Structures are given as C-alpha cells and as structure tokens.
C-alpha cells in the first residue's frame, strides 16, 4: 500500500533515503497485533484511531489524556494517517499524569499490568508496548521493563532527551528491551537524543506529526516520538510473521538502514528503523 504525503517519519521508515513523502507498507498494516501505549493515556475518541484505540488502565483520577503526549504516540503507532501500523489495536495505559510526570512506582505498576492484561486480549499476531517516558537510572524500573519483555511483549522505550549516554536513564538502560534514539528528517541524530551502547535502533523523533487531544494534531520532537515508530514497526512486522516479540528488536536492527545517520558518536549503533517493504 502507499500513503502519499505521509509524515516524514513514516516515509523514512519505508525508504532507504531521506526526504521522501510516501509511506510504503504492506496492507496487513499490523492487523492482529496490539500495542500498549504506556503514557498519559489515549483520547480513544479521536477519529484517527477509527475505534481501534481504548483505555485499559489509569493510575490517576481519570483515564482521560489531559496532556496530549500519549495520544500523540498512539497516533504514531497506529492512527490512520500518522501511524506506522494502521490496523493495530491500541491499548492505553495512563502512567503519567496530565503534567506528563509519573512516579517510578506507578510506571512499574503500569508495566506489570500490561504483562498480565495481555492474557485477556485477542492479539494473535503478538503484543508490543511503547514506552515514551523515562527518568534517571532505576534498577527497579529497568527490571519492570525486563519482566514485561520476558512476559512475551516486544518492549520499546525512549533513549531519553538528554543528549547524554542513555546508560544513566531508565528504562532506557535496560539491556533486554528495545531502546530507541531519535533522528531528524535529514538523517541527523536529533540534537536532544541520548546515545550509547545501550541504544538498539533509531527512529524519526524530530518534528513528528501525529494525533493530539481535542481531536487535533501537532508536531513534537523527542525520543519519546521515535519510540512509537519502532513499536508500530514491530507490530507491523509481527503481523507479517517476519519476527516475534522476543526477536523483533534484533530483527529491526538487522534489517535497519545502516550508516545513514550523522552525528552518531562512536560506540552507538548507526541504524535507522526500516520496514524493507517491497511492492
């Protein structure tokens, strides 16, 4: 299939070269997969989700995304226009309050919830979690991400926006999950993107257009924006039978665009998420 005039990140993840505007993807589109967006929530009513999004858990007085961040990332995972995996099921897990912050304990609880909640859901193609959040290093936060991954969920987390080594951040520094750096539309590492050996993969992260609350749209930058690209790509590749939850991160790394990014410090992978789609 082809989405013309797609946001630059969707185009990028289906192209070997920057600057294109068409998103090429297999029509299966992640149908049969599920992606938990662990974030400020999801405005499930946004038309762009075509009813494929729902709130499943909140850690605050409301399930409403009163911030936008989580609606934005769900949109990049799976909205009709802004989404990588345009037929996936989205489940919202509100671990961040409307100011976008959440205690470590709450984020850990949210991941343990997904590990269990997926057994109540129909996801024949597999289960992804997209974690656009982070804080300082935390062994317990890391372990939570590792459990979620162990439980059979492809976990993707943001490297963090500190222009620093991601080893000092969690869950970015958990080895067993897919830690995602940000690139911009000129195939430069995003100026804010963390880096380091713990990074597994880069995705579009700078000026990413997606859904916003109020049924609106906006463009935001952050590794938190690159993360849902990789999660949607995993859900897409899982639906296509090309990889599994346990292997999707490595599979995406293996099949990535290699060496195309600039300002990747030595010791950090130079790999850009790519769907290798062929009409």
UniProtKB/Swiss-Prot annotation:
Lineage, top ranks: Eukaryota, Fungi, Dikarya, Ascomycota, Pezizomycotina
Highest taxon of the lineage: Eukaryota
Entry binding sites for Ca(2+) 1: 175, 177, 200
Name of the protein in question: Proteinase K
Positions annotated to bind Ca(2+) 2: 16, 260
Function: Hydrolyzes keratin at aromatic and hydrophobic residues.
Single Gene Ontology MF annotation: serine-type endopeptidase activity
Domain Peptidase S8: 7-279
Provenance organism: Parengyodontium album
Enzyme Commission number, as recorded: 3.4.21.64
Co-factor requirement: Ca(2+)
Family: Belongs to the peptidase S8 family.
Active site: 39 (charge relay system), 69 (charge relay system), 224 (charge relay system)
GO cellular component: extracellular region
Entry keywords, A to Z: Calcium, Disulfide bond, Hydrolase, Metal-binding, Protease, Serine protease, Signal, Zymogen
Whole-protein residues included: 106 to 384 of 384
Disulfide bridge positions per record: 34-123, 178-249
């Amino acid at each position: 299939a082809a989405q013309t005039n797609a946001p630059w990140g969707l185009a990028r993840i289906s192209s070997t070269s920057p600057g294109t505007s068409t998103y090429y993807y297999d029509e299966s589109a992640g149908q049969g997969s599920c992606v938990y967006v662990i974030d400020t929530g999801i405005e499930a009513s946004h038309p762009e989700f075509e009813g494929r999004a729902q709130m499943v858990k909140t850690y605050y007085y409301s399930s409403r995304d009163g911030n936008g961040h989580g609606t934005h990332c769900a949109g990049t995972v799976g909205s009709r226009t802004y989404g990588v995996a345009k037929k996936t099921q989205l489940f919202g897990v509100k671990v961040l309050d409307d100011n976008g912050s959440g205690q470590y304990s709450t984020i850990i609880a949210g991941m343990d919830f997904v590990a269990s909640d997926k057994n109540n859901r129909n996801c024949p193609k597999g289960v992804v979690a997209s974690l656009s959040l982070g804080g300082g290093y935390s062994s317990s936060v890391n372990s939570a991400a590792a459990r979620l991954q162990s439980s059979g969920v492809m976990v993707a987390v943001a490297a963090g926006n500190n222009n620093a080594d991601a080893r000092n951040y969690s869950p970015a520094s958990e080895p067993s999950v897919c830690t995602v750096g940000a690139s911009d539309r000129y195939d430069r590492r995003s100026s804010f993107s963390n880096y380091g050996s713990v990074l597994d993969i880069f995705g579009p992260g700078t000026s990413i257009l997606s859904t916003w609350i109020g049924g609106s749209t906006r463009s935001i930058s952050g590794t938190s924006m690159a993360t849902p690209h990789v999660a949607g790509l995993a859900a897409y590749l899982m639906t296509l039978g090309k990889t599994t939850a346990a292997s999707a991160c490595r599979y995406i790394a293996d099949t990535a665009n290699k060496g195309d990014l600039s300002n990747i410090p030595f010791g950090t992978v130079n790999l850009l998420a790519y769907n290798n789609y062929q009409a």
